[PDB]
PDB file of C-alpha atoms in Angstrom:
ATOM      1  CA  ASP C   1       5.465  41.511  -8.038  1.00  0.00           C
ATOM      2  CA  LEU C   2       7.514  38.427  -9.029  1.00  0.00           C
ATOM      3  CA  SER C   3       4.534  36.053  -9.445  1.00  0.00           C
ATOM      4  CA  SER C   4       5.155  35.308 -13.163  1.00  0.00           C
ATOM      5  CA  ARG C   5       8.851  34.208 -12.735  1.00  0.00           C
ATOM      6  CA  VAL C   6       8.061  32.324  -9.448  1.00  0.00           C
ATOM      7  CA  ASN C   7       5.167  30.352 -11.094  1.00  0.00           C
ATOM      8  CA  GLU C   8       7.343  29.664 -14.176  1.00  0.00           C
ATOM      9  CA  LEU C   9      10.170  28.397 -11.892  1.00  0.00           C
ATOM     10  CA  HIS C  10       7.777  26.136  -9.893  1.00  0.00           C
ATOM     11  CA  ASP C  11       6.383  24.670 -13.209  1.00  0.00           C
ATOM     12  CA  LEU C  12       9.868  24.067 -14.772  1.00  0.00           C
ATOM     13  CA  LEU C  13      11.414  22.679 -11.534  1.00  0.00           C
ATOM     14  CA  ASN C  14       8.461  20.370 -10.788  1.00  0.00           C
ATOM     15  CA  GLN C  15       8.455  19.084 -14.410  1.00  0.00           C
ATOM     16  CA  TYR C  16      12.259  18.520 -14.614  1.00  0.00           C
ATOM     17  CA  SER C  17      12.406  16.921 -11.084  1.00  0.00           C
ATOM     18  CA  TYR C  18       9.645  14.461 -12.054  1.00  0.00           C
ATOM     19  CA  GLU C  19      11.313  13.665 -15.433  1.00  0.00           C
ATOM     20  CA  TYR C  20      14.640  12.924 -13.660  1.00  0.00           C
ATOM     21  CA  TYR C  21      13.677  11.350 -10.290  1.00  0.00           C
ATOM     22  CA  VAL C  22      10.446   9.562 -11.246  1.00  0.00           C
ATOM     23  CA  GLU C  23      10.815   8.862 -15.004  1.00  0.00           C
ATOM     24  CA  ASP C  24      14.667   8.662 -15.251  1.00  0.00           C
ATOM     25  CA  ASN C  25      14.365  10.531 -18.579  1.00  0.00           C
ATOM     26  CA  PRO C  26      15.599  14.146 -17.996  1.00  0.00           C
ATOM     27  CA  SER C  27      14.806  16.784 -20.667  1.00  0.00           C
ATOM     28  CA  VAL C  28      17.529  19.096 -19.240  1.00  0.00           C
ATOM     29  CA  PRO C  29      21.049  18.548 -17.740  1.00  0.00           C
ATOM     30  CA  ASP C  30      21.672  18.934 -13.980  1.00  0.00           C
ATOM     31  CA  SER C  31      23.426  22.273 -14.670  1.00  0.00           C
ATOM     32  CA  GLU C  32      20.057  23.713 -15.860  1.00  0.00           C
ATOM     33  CA  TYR C  33      18.034  22.246 -12.979  1.00  0.00           C
ATOM     34  CA  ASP C  34      20.684  23.501 -10.456  1.00  0.00           C
ATOM     35  CA  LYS C  35      20.674  26.972 -12.024  1.00  0.00           C
ATOM     36  CA  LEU C  36      16.853  27.318 -11.838  1.00  0.00           C
ATOM     37  CA  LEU C  37      16.771  26.034  -8.264  1.00  0.00           C
ATOM     38  CA  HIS C  38      19.435  28.543  -7.134  1.00  0.00           C
ATOM     39  CA  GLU C  39      17.409  31.333  -8.825  1.00  0.00           C
ATOM     40  CA  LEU C  40      14.251  30.283  -6.862  1.00  0.00           C
ATOM     41  CA  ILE C  41      16.203  29.942  -3.566  1.00  0.00           C
ATOM     42  CA  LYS C  42      17.541  33.527  -4.172  1.00  0.00           C
ATOM     43  CA  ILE C  43      13.980  34.869  -4.907  1.00  0.00           C
ATOM     44  CA  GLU C  44      12.662  33.245  -1.685  1.00  0.00           C
ATOM     45  CA  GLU C  45      15.582  34.621   0.366  1.00  0.00           C
ATOM     46  CA  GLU C  46      15.111  38.194  -0.914  1.00  0.00           C
ATOM     47  CA  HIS C  47      11.312  37.971  -1.204  1.00  0.00           C
ATOM     48  CA  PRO C  48      10.071  35.462   1.461  1.00  0.00           C
ATOM     49  CA  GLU C  49       6.362  36.100   0.676  1.00  0.00           C
ATOM     50  CA  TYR C  50       6.876  33.641  -2.305  1.00  0.00           C
ATOM     51  CA  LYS C  51       7.868  30.711  -0.061  1.00  0.00           C
ATOM     52  CA  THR C  52       5.185  27.996  -0.313  1.00  0.00           C
ATOM     53  CA  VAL C  53       4.598  24.754   1.597  1.00  0.00           C
ATOM     54  CA  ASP C  54       5.161  22.751  -1.692  1.00  0.00           C
ATOM     55  CA  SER C  55       7.924  24.918  -3.193  1.00  0.00           C
ATOM     56  CA  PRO C  56      10.688  22.990  -5.053  1.00  0.00           C
ATOM     57  CA  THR C  57      13.131  24.567  -2.505  1.00  0.00           C
ATOM     58  CA  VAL C  58      11.586  22.316   0.243  1.00  0.00           C
ATOM     59  CA  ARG C  59      13.749  19.453  -1.264  1.00  0.00           C
ATOM     60  CA  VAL C  60      17.010  21.037  -0.091  1.00  0.00           C
ATOM     61  CA  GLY C  61      15.945  20.720   3.597  1.00  0.00           C
ATOM     62  CA  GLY C  62      15.689  23.557   6.048  1.00  0.00           C
ATOM     63  CA  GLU C  63      15.798  24.729   9.650  1.00  0.00           C
ATOM     64  CA  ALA C  64      12.854  22.693  11.160  1.00  0.00           C
ATOM     65  CA  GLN C  65      14.020  19.328  12.497  1.00  0.00           C
ATOM     66  CA  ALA C  66      11.942  16.134  12.280  1.00  0.00           C
ATOM     67  CA  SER C  67      10.427  15.687  15.789  1.00  0.00           C
ATOM     68  CA  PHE C  68      10.798  11.844  15.864  1.00  0.00           C
ATOM     69  CA  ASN C  69       7.552  11.931  17.972  1.00  0.00           C
ATOM     70  CA  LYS C  70       5.705   8.592  18.433  1.00  0.00           C
ATOM     71  CA  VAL C  71       2.588   8.971  16.257  1.00  0.00           C
ATOM     72  CA  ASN C  72      -0.118   6.461  15.434  1.00  0.00           C
ATOM     73  CA  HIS C  73      -0.761   5.645  11.755  1.00  0.00           C
ATOM     74  CA  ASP C  74      -4.395   6.508  10.702  1.00  0.00           C
ATOM     75  CA  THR C  75      -4.604   2.761   9.930  1.00  0.00           C
ATOM     76  CA  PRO C  76      -2.175   0.116  11.247  1.00  0.00           C
ATOM     77  CA  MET C  77       0.207  -1.247   8.616  1.00  0.00           C
ATOM     78  CA  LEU C  78      -0.123  -4.918   7.608  1.00  0.00           C
ATOM     79  CA  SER C  79       1.998  -7.708   9.052  1.00  0.00           C
ATOM     80  CA  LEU C  80       2.538 -10.296   6.290  1.00  0.00           C
ATOM     81  CA  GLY C  81       3.054 -14.083   6.577  1.00  0.00           C
ATOM     82  CA  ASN C  82       6.259 -15.459   5.023  1.00  0.00           C
ATOM     83  CA  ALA C  83       6.972 -18.035   2.275  1.00  0.00           C
ATOM     84  CA  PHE C  84      10.408 -19.635   1.798  1.00  0.00           C
ATOM     85  CA  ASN C  85       9.847 -21.961  -1.184  1.00  0.00           C
ATOM     86  CA  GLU C  86       7.523 -23.040  -3.988  1.00  0.00           C
ATOM     87  CA  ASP C  87       5.698 -25.431  -1.561  1.00  0.00           C
ATOM     88  CA  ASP C  88       4.691 -22.532   0.820  1.00  0.00           C
ATOM     89  CA  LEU C  89       3.342 -20.629  -2.209  1.00  0.00           C
ATOM     90  CA  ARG C  90       1.372 -23.735  -3.390  1.00  0.00           C
ATOM     91  CA  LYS C  91      -0.103 -24.019   0.162  1.00  0.00           C
ATOM     92  CA  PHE C  92      -1.074 -20.273   0.227  1.00  0.00           C
ATOM     93  CA  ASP C  93      -2.754 -20.683  -3.192  1.00  0.00           C
ATOM     94  CA  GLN C  94      -4.535 -23.924  -2.102  1.00  0.00           C
ATOM     95  CA  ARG C  95      -6.122 -22.285   0.992  1.00  0.00           C
ATOM     96  CA  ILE C  96      -7.322 -19.345  -1.241  1.00  0.00           C
ATOM     97  CA  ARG C  97      -8.672 -21.664  -4.005  1.00  0.00           C
ATOM     98  CA  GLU C  98     -10.422 -23.924  -1.407  1.00  0.00           C
ATOM     99  CA  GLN C  99     -12.226 -20.835  -0.017  1.00  0.00           C
ATOM    100  CA  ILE C 100     -13.004 -18.416  -2.910  1.00  0.00           C
ATOM    101  CA  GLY C 101     -12.157 -20.182  -6.216  1.00  0.00           C
ATOM    102  CA  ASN C 102      -9.535 -19.424  -8.841  1.00  0.00           C
ATOM    103  CA  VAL C 103      -8.396 -15.785  -8.487  1.00  0.00           C
ATOM    104  CA  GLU C 104      -5.878 -13.438 -10.100  1.00  0.00           C
ATOM    105  CA  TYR C 105      -2.629 -12.600  -8.244  1.00  0.00           C
ATOM    106  CA  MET C 106      -0.630  -9.456  -8.212  1.00  0.00           C
ATOM    107  CA  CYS C 107       3.152 -10.044  -7.892  1.00  0.00           C
ATOM    108  CA  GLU C 108       5.583  -7.265  -6.869  1.00  0.00           C
ATOM    109  CA  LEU C 109       9.158  -6.806  -5.718  1.00  0.00           C
ATOM    110  CA  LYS C 110       9.631  -6.422  -1.982  1.00  0.00           C
ATOM    111  CA  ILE C 111      12.057  -3.498  -1.655  1.00  0.00           C
ATOM    112  CA  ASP C 112      14.742  -3.851   1.044  1.00  0.00           C
ATOM    113  CA  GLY C 113      14.163  -0.444   2.566  1.00  0.00           C
ATOM    114  CA  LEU C 114      12.438   1.390   5.383  1.00  0.00           C
ATOM    115  CA  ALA C 115       8.665   1.004   5.389  1.00  0.00           C
ATOM    116  CA  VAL C 116       6.952   4.413   5.657  1.00  0.00           C
ATOM    117  CA  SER C 117       3.401   5.820   5.881  1.00  0.00           C
ATOM    118  CA  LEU C 118       2.847   9.098   4.005  1.00  0.00           C
ATOM    119  CA  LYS C 119      -0.259  11.017   4.943  1.00  0.00           C
ATOM    120  CA  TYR C 120      -1.838  13.527   2.468  1.00  0.00           C
ATOM    121  CA  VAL C 121      -4.539  15.980   3.553  1.00  0.00           C
ATOM    122  CA  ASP C 122      -6.292  17.887   0.770  1.00  0.00           C
ATOM    123  CA  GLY C 123      -3.652  16.374  -1.636  1.00  0.00           C
ATOM    124  CA  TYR C 124      -0.680  17.894   0.255  1.00  0.00           C
ATOM    125  CA  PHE C 125       2.046  15.785   1.922  1.00  0.00           C
ATOM    126  CA  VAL C 126       1.695  16.664   5.664  1.00  0.00           C
ATOM    127  CA  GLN C 127       3.089  13.673   7.688  1.00  0.00           C
ATOM    128  CA  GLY C 128       5.529  10.865   7.072  1.00  0.00           C
ATOM    129  CA  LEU C 129       6.064   8.115   9.662  1.00  0.00           C
ATOM    130  CA  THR C 130       8.345   5.114   9.931  1.00  0.00           C
ATOM    131  CA  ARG C 131       6.411   1.789  10.272  1.00  0.00           C
ATOM    132  CA  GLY C 132       7.564   1.335  13.917  1.00  0.00           C
ATOM    133  CA  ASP C 133       5.528  -1.554  15.495  1.00  0.00           C
ATOM    134  CA  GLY C 134       2.889  -1.234  12.699  1.00  0.00           C
ATOM    135  CA  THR C 135       0.537   0.867  14.888  1.00  0.00           C
ATOM    136  CA  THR C 136       2.879   3.667  16.104  1.00  0.00           C
ATOM    137  CA  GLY C 137       5.870   5.035  14.153  1.00  0.00           C
ATOM    138  CA  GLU C 138       8.326   7.954  14.355  1.00  0.00           C
ATOM    139  CA  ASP C 139       7.621  11.360  12.754  1.00  0.00           C
ATOM    140  CA  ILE C 140      10.331  11.876  10.142  1.00  0.00           C
ATOM    141  CA  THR C 141       8.266  14.215   7.864  1.00  0.00           C
ATOM    142  CA  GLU C 142      10.997  16.918   7.470  1.00  0.00           C
ATOM    143  CA  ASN C 143      13.587  14.354   6.233  1.00  0.00           C
ATOM    144  CA  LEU C 144      11.124  12.544   3.898  1.00  0.00           C
ATOM    145  CA  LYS C 145      10.296  15.926   2.199  1.00  0.00           C
ATOM    146  CA  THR C 146      13.825  15.874   0.779  1.00  0.00           C
ATOM    147  CA  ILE C 147      13.105  12.781  -1.311  1.00  0.00           C
ATOM    148  CA  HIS C 148      12.110  13.907  -4.857  1.00  0.00           C
ATOM    149  CA  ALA C 149      10.224  10.651  -5.549  1.00  0.00           C
ATOM    150  CA  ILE C 150       7.714  11.663  -2.820  1.00  0.00           C
ATOM    151  CA  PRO C 151       5.182  14.206  -4.249  1.00  0.00           C
ATOM    152  CA  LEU C 152       4.680  17.331  -2.126  1.00  0.00           C
ATOM    153  CA  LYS C 153       1.258  17.688  -3.783  1.00  0.00           C
ATOM    154  CA  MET C 154      -0.920  15.072  -5.517  1.00  0.00           C
ATOM    155  CA  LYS C 155      -2.985  15.602  -8.705  1.00  0.00           C
ATOM    156  CA  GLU C 156      -6.268  15.277  -6.753  1.00  0.00           C
ATOM    157  CA  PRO C 157      -6.937  16.763  -3.276  1.00  0.00           C
ATOM    158  CA  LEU C 158      -7.416  13.425  -1.436  1.00  0.00           C
ATOM    159  CA  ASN C 159      -7.090  12.618   2.272  1.00  0.00           C
ATOM    160  CA  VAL C 160      -5.186   9.306   2.127  1.00  0.00           C
ATOM    161  CA  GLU C 161      -2.281   7.559   3.855  1.00  0.00           C
ATOM    162  CA  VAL C 162      -0.064   5.790   1.303  1.00  0.00           C
ATOM    163  CA  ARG C 163       2.474   3.116   2.246  1.00  0.00           C
ATOM    164  CA  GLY C 164       5.893   2.828   0.626  1.00  0.00           C
ATOM    165  CA  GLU C 165       9.526   1.717   1.003  1.00  0.00           C
ATOM    166  CA  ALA C 166      12.149   4.429   1.275  1.00  0.00           C
ATOM    167  CA  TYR C 167      15.545   3.237  -0.044  1.00  0.00           C
ATOM    168  CA  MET C 168      19.008   4.220  -1.266  1.00  0.00           C
ATOM    169  CA  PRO C 169      19.783   3.168  -4.882  1.00  0.00           C
ATOM    170  CA  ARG C 170      22.625   0.611  -4.817  1.00  0.00           C
ATOM    171  CA  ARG C 171      25.185   2.677  -6.893  1.00  0.00           C
ATOM    172  CA  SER C 172      24.595   5.668  -4.494  1.00  0.00           C
ATOM    173  CA  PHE C 173      25.162   3.387  -1.486  1.00  0.00           C
ATOM    174  CA  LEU C 174      28.413   2.032  -3.079  1.00  0.00           C
ATOM    175  CA  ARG C 175      29.669   5.567  -3.964  1.00  0.00           C
ATOM    176  CA  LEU C 176      28.850   6.747  -0.394  1.00  0.00           C
ATOM    177  CA  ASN C 177      30.855   3.865   1.116  1.00  0.00           C
ATOM    178  CA  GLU C 178      33.836   4.871  -1.078  1.00  0.00           C
ATOM    179  CA  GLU C 179      33.706   8.400   0.475  1.00  0.00           C
ATOM    180  CA  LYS C 180      33.457   6.903   4.009  1.00  0.00           C
ATOM    181  CA  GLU C 181      36.543   4.694   3.336  1.00  0.00           C
ATOM    182  CA  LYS C 182      38.482   7.941   2.432  1.00  0.00           C
ATOM    183  CA  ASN C 183      37.639   9.772   5.712  1.00  0.00           C
ATOM    184  CA  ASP C 184      38.550   6.585   7.755  1.00  0.00           C
ATOM    185  CA  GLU C 185      34.788   6.203   8.608  1.00  0.00           C
ATOM    186  CA  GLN C 186      32.791   2.971   9.252  1.00  0.00           C
ATOM    187  CA  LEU C 187      31.043   1.722   6.160  1.00  0.00           C
ATOM    188  CA  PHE C 188      27.318   1.115   6.110  1.00  0.00           C
ATOM    189  CA  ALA C 189      26.645  -2.688   5.957  1.00  0.00           C
ATOM    190  CA  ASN C 190      24.013  -2.359   3.187  1.00  0.00           C
ATOM    191  CA  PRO C 191      21.760   0.206   1.363  1.00  0.00           C
ATOM    192  CA  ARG C 192      19.002  -0.325   3.962  1.00  0.00           C
ATOM    193  CA  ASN C 193      21.287   0.700   6.858  1.00  0.00           C
ATOM    194  CA  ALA C 194      22.514   3.712   4.788  1.00  0.00           C
ATOM    195  CA  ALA C 195      18.885   4.857   4.073  1.00  0.00           C
ATOM    196  CA  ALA C 196      18.027   4.407   7.836  1.00  0.00           C
ATOM    197  CA  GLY C 197      21.066   6.517   8.835  1.00  0.00           C
ATOM    198  CA  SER C 198      19.988   9.182   6.271  1.00  0.00           C
ATOM    199  CA  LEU C 199      16.439   9.432   7.558  1.00  0.00           C
ATOM    200  CA  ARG C 200      17.594   9.585  11.238  1.00  0.00           C
ATOM    201  CA  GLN C 201      19.600  12.833  10.760  1.00  0.00           C
ATOM    202  CA  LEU C 202      18.678  15.692  13.130  1.00  0.00           C
ATOM    203  CA  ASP C 203      19.100  18.077  10.178  1.00  0.00           C
ATOM    204  CA  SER C 204      16.984  17.623   6.994  1.00  0.00           C
ATOM    205  CA  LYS C 205      19.806  19.420   5.046  1.00  0.00           C
ATOM    206  CA  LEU C 206      22.024  16.375   5.832  1.00  0.00           C
ATOM    207  CA  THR C 207      19.263  13.925   4.561  1.00  0.00           C
ATOM    208  CA  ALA C 208      18.936  16.030   1.324  1.00  0.00           C
ATOM    209  CA  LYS C 209      22.667  15.420   0.458  1.00  0.00           C
ATOM    210  CA  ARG C 210      21.952  11.659   0.418  1.00  0.00           C
ATOM    211  CA  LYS C 211      20.410  10.094  -2.615  1.00  0.00           C
ATOM    212  CA  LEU C 212      17.099   8.549  -1.538  1.00  0.00           C
ATOM    213  CA  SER C 213      13.989   7.334  -3.434  1.00  0.00           C
ATOM    214  CA  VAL C 214      10.692   5.551  -2.674  1.00  0.00           C
ATOM    215  CA  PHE C 215       8.250   3.061  -4.183  1.00  0.00           C
ATOM    216  CA  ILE C 216       4.572   3.255  -3.097  1.00  0.00           C
ATOM    217  CA  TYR C 217       2.900  -0.193  -2.773  1.00  0.00           C
ATOM    218  CA  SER C 218      -0.518   0.529  -1.133  1.00  0.00           C
ATOM    219  CA  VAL C 219      -2.997   2.952   0.532  1.00  0.00           C
ATOM    220  CA  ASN C 220      -4.819   2.719   3.944  1.00  0.00           C
ATOM    221  CA  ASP C 221      -8.290   3.411   2.448  1.00  0.00           C
ATOM    222  CA  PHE C 222      -9.617   2.784  -1.143  1.00  0.00           C
ATOM    223  CA  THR C 223     -12.850   4.856  -0.682  1.00  0.00           C
ATOM    224  CA  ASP C 224     -11.587   7.698  -2.963  1.00  0.00           C
ATOM    225  CA  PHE C 225     -10.031   5.281  -5.501  1.00  0.00           C
ATOM    226  CA  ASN C 226     -11.881   3.835  -8.471  1.00  0.00           C
ATOM    227  CA  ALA C 227      -9.541   0.809  -8.427  1.00  0.00           C
ATOM    228  CA  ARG C 228     -11.345  -2.570  -8.180  1.00  0.00           C
ATOM    229  CA  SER C 229      -7.957  -4.339  -7.661  1.00  0.00           C
ATOM    230  CA  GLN C 230      -4.425  -3.888  -6.261  1.00  0.00           C
ATOM    231  CA  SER C 231      -2.968  -3.517  -9.804  1.00  0.00           C
ATOM    232  CA  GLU C 232      -5.552  -0.830 -10.734  1.00  0.00           C
ATOM    233  CA  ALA C 233      -4.758   0.955  -7.366  1.00  0.00           C
ATOM    234  CA  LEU C 234      -1.058   1.203  -8.317  1.00  0.00           C
ATOM    235  CA  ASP C 235      -2.002   2.489 -11.841  1.00  0.00           C
ATOM    236  CA  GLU C 236      -4.257   5.076 -10.119  1.00  0.00           C
ATOM    237  CA  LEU C 237      -1.361   6.045  -7.742  1.00  0.00           C
ATOM    238  CA  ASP C 238       0.756   6.623 -10.898  1.00  0.00           C
ATOM    239  CA  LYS C 239      -1.965   8.961 -12.297  1.00  0.00           C
ATOM    240  CA  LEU C 240      -2.242  10.782  -8.926  1.00  0.00           C
ATOM    241  CA  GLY C 241       1.525  11.578  -9.108  1.00  0.00           C
ATOM    242  CA  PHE C 242       3.255   8.876  -6.938  1.00  0.00           C
ATOM    243  CA  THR C 243       6.345   6.776  -7.795  1.00  0.00           C
ATOM    244  CA  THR C 244       5.510   3.099  -8.049  1.00  0.00           C
ATOM    245  CA  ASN C 245       7.590   0.071  -9.031  1.00  0.00           C
ATOM    246  CA  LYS C 246       7.131  -0.815 -12.720  1.00  0.00           C
ATOM    247  CA  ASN C 247       8.103  -4.540 -12.249  1.00  0.00           C
ATOM    248  CA  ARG C 248       4.689  -5.582 -10.797  1.00  0.00           C
ATOM    249  CA  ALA C 249       2.710  -8.228 -12.698  1.00  0.00           C
ATOM    250  CA  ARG C 250      -0.817  -9.688 -12.818  1.00  0.00           C
ATOM    251  CA  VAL C 251      -0.796 -13.520 -13.076  1.00  0.00           C
ATOM    252  CA  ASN C 252      -3.779 -15.870 -13.472  1.00  0.00           C
ATOM    253  CA  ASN C 253      -2.590 -18.643 -11.176  1.00  0.00           C
ATOM    254  CA  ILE C 254       0.090 -20.300  -9.055  1.00  0.00           C
ATOM    255  CA  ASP C 255       2.191 -21.309 -12.126  1.00  0.00           C
ATOM    256  CA  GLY C 256       2.384 -17.575 -13.025  1.00  0.00           C
ATOM    257  CA  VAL C 257       3.479 -16.728  -9.452  1.00  0.00           C
ATOM    258  CA  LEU C 258       6.235 -19.367  -9.463  1.00  0.00           C
ATOM    259  CA  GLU C 259       7.408 -18.160 -12.885  1.00  0.00           C
ATOM    260  CA  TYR C 260       7.581 -14.581 -11.526  1.00  0.00           C
ATOM    261  CA  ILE C 261       9.665 -15.659  -8.462  1.00  0.00           C
ATOM    262  CA  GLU C 262      11.867 -17.781 -10.808  1.00  0.00           C
ATOM    263  CA  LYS C 263      12.381 -14.754 -13.145  1.00  0.00           C
ATOM    264  CA  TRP C 264      13.307 -12.332 -10.329  1.00  0.00           C
ATOM    265  CA  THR C 265      15.703 -14.801  -8.507  1.00  0.00           C
ATOM    266  CA  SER C 266      17.842 -14.624 -11.733  1.00  0.00           C
ATOM    267  CA  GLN C 267      17.124 -10.932 -12.556  1.00  0.00           C
ATOM    268  CA  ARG C 268      17.465  -9.278  -9.050  1.00  0.00           C
ATOM    269  CA  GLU C 269      21.269  -8.609  -9.366  1.00  0.00           C
ATOM    270  CA  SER C 270      20.610  -6.402 -12.464  1.00  0.00           C
ATOM    271  CA  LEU C 271      18.267  -4.089 -10.490  1.00  0.00           C
ATOM    272  CA  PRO C 272      19.506  -0.623  -9.370  1.00  0.00           C
ATOM    273  CA  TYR C 273      18.116  -1.359  -5.832  1.00  0.00           C
ATOM    274  CA  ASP C 274      18.183  -4.242  -3.287  1.00  0.00           C
ATOM    275  CA  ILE C 275      15.145  -6.509  -2.959  1.00  0.00           C
ATOM    276  CA  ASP C 276      14.594  -8.936   0.019  1.00  0.00           C
ATOM    277  CA  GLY C 277      11.633 -10.764  -1.462  1.00  0.00           C
ATOM    278  CA  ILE C 278       8.470 -10.772  -3.533  1.00  0.00           C
ATOM    279  CA  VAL C 279       4.909  -9.959  -2.308  1.00  0.00           C
ATOM    280  CA  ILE C 280       1.997 -11.970  -3.725  1.00  0.00           C
ATOM    281  CA  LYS C 281      -1.528 -10.651  -3.182  1.00  0.00           C
ATOM    282  CA  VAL C 282      -4.999 -11.704  -4.278  1.00  0.00           C
ATOM    283  CA  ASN C 283      -5.516  -8.932  -6.872  1.00  0.00           C
ATOM    284  CA  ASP C 284      -9.290  -8.236  -6.481  1.00  0.00           C
ATOM    285  CA  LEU C 285     -10.061  -5.989  -3.469  1.00  0.00           C
ATOM    286  CA  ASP C 286     -13.473  -7.595  -2.704  1.00  0.00           C
ATOM    287  CA  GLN C 287     -11.813 -11.050  -2.857  1.00  0.00           C
ATOM    288  CA  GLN C 288      -9.175  -9.728  -0.372  1.00  0.00           C
ATOM    289  CA  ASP C 289     -12.177  -8.860   1.905  1.00  0.00           C
ATOM    290  CA  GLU C 290     -13.777 -12.329   1.359  1.00  0.00           C
ATOM    291  CA  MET C 291     -10.469 -14.012   2.454  1.00  0.00           C
ATOM    292  CA  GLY C 292     -10.180 -12.066   5.703  1.00  0.00           C
ATOM    293  CA  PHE C 293      -7.445 -12.439   8.355  1.00  0.00           C
ATOM    294  CA  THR C 294      -5.700 -14.659  10.837  1.00  0.00           C
ATOM    295  CA  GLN C 295      -5.271 -13.190  14.336  1.00  0.00           C
ATOM    296  CA  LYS C 296      -2.340 -11.072  13.021  1.00  0.00           C
ATOM    297  CA  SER C 297      -2.046 -11.315   9.206  1.00  0.00           C
ATOM    298  CA  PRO C 298      -3.951 -11.198   5.901  1.00  0.00           C
ATOM    299  CA  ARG C 299      -4.947 -14.597   4.509  1.00  0.00           C
ATOM    300  CA  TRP C 300      -4.734 -12.938   0.996  1.00  0.00           C
ATOM    301  CA  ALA C 301      -1.080 -11.797   0.999  1.00  0.00           C
ATOM    302  CA  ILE C 302       2.270 -13.571   1.448  1.00  0.00           C
ATOM    303  CA  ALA C 303       5.898 -12.382   1.404  1.00  0.00           C
ATOM    304  CA  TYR C 304       8.230 -14.778  -0.398  1.00  0.00           C
ATOM    305  CA  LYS C 305      11.761 -14.309   1.073  1.00  0.00           C
ATOM    306  CA  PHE C 306      15.005 -14.926  -0.924  1.00  0.00           C
ATOM    307  CA  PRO C 307      17.467 -17.421   0.661  1.00  0.00           C
TER     308      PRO C 307
END
């Protein structure tokens, strides 16, 4: 045998899933996607030799449970300093400009979700961890596999650990809380709590019924990337098959940063997801190196927090 129909079904399902979940521009209706997926599930039931580690059927969840084992990240995740106003951002920019000159900033939305590390070996998704304390997180790989915005296989066979924010889109949170109201159940307080509850299921089939997504914001190691900057690294992640947040911007200076924060204070309610802040980074990777660290935090990144 059935190799021709199985390979055709993988190609069509992977294309349509990407178009819908990553591009929000489906070329087919859900009835067509659902029909093709059921056909592939039926082939794999009756002919299990066609099951693959990266099959589209992985998204529906299965029998293996996430272990929730304590596992160290290959590289500890960053702990960022905070900013609460325009003055903190001017101070951040002053200490950079006093040390390394006038630099470019990358600005991005800080997604109100669950921070995750996603490890790829030979281009295949093999391990997904919660942030935990930044060094050690919980193994939730089986549940994370159900999120369509996470690629099961990258376009190049790299060994990398990407960092992202898993979240529930706001309209899916609101619709879920309506259901909970109707079964006399306790509502989730916010999308973040709903996404946390979804990823803590013992059964990945339960996680799969919840509508989750991700945005990838960084990688542990840039050795296999041609990116010379944070903004080029996110463009490269796009080419490699990840889901990144399109609202990132390169700005020349502190005025550009303040304008970006000003824009998104007014525009954040219109977004289909919750944001808790904005992350500003020195864009150039070598300049990030030149800036170095405090005892705990990068001197080249700051998280602006909304009031």
